[PDB]
Amino acid sequence: GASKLRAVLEKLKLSRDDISTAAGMVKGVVDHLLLRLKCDSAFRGVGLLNTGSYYEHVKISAPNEFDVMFKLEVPRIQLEEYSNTRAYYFVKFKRNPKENPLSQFLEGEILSASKMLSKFRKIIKEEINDIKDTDVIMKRKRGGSPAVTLLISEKISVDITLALESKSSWPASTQEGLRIQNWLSAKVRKQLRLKPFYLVPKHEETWRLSFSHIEKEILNNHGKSKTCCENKEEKCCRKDCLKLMKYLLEQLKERFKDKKHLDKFSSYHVKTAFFHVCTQNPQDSQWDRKDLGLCFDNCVTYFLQCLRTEKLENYFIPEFNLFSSNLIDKRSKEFLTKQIEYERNNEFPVFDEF
């Protein structure tokens, strides 16, 4: 069934790749933000996660929706796990020059997210009206993990997220996570765990881990074979399968935005499930581009099985269950399950329409 899947993959490639003014209007906004935050007391160490990363699209169908992360280095951090949750933490400080820059947001020993996300929101909203180039509107609708959302002109839309960076070892709830040893090798997993980790706020004053940088690195070096996709002798469909899980869910989320049943689902749940299938199917031969449709079916199948059983291990923190009934109720997962099965049986109609 590769014919129709390819056609949808091509439609989407041609709008990512198409000449767009958006990325420019974004870069100039973030560049001004950075220098205005950098000469400030609390944010002098702010930076962009990457460079050349003004164009990260979480919404694979919506190309005018951008996502930027600003990172801040926190040296000698004290992490405390909240309520045995495995994945949510308080931040505190070892205090060497016990007047570290962030000291103005403390609460006894515990670092306050919501205060930071206000001096941050206010410092940005300050230099936003100072902007004379183009139009910039920020809305502070609740849910501050897409913390600050800027709107540039009418179409294009930017989500600014602020993250803490630590260069120490990943927290101990990740110790058994990232089980890539039989796929990407034990020595790549060590290499990856030598990288820094990042914290963002939850919605209490708790923080969660952000592994987008590691996803990115897996996705750009994703084969059991070192030369995967450096050719078309050996071009695989891993990335394409991920794109079709993402597009499947954005389309279902959009088609059913009126009713509320899909609101807790995000691309994070799709990425997670996908990598678990990469771990189950570690050989490049199990991802032949000839077999796009079969491999996609595996992904859809596996995800649906997570829903019905209410189990989807975080890829990095094996004890944390993304589909726990306390995180997402049975009603919802049972709803997503039915909707997807209706797609799968009908050769996914949600695709030929845009």
Ligand SMILES: Cn1cc(-c2ccc(F)c(CNC(=O)c3cc(Br)ccc3O)c2)cn1
């Ligand atoms: C959008 N959203 C994320 C969380 C969340 C919650 C708890 C938690 F521990 C984590 C850890 N992050 C990942 O597992 C992760 C996996 C991949 Br693949 C890529 C990036 C990632 O950050 C995330 C909640 N909403």
Ligand SMILES: [Zn+2]
């Ligand atoms: Zn490949």
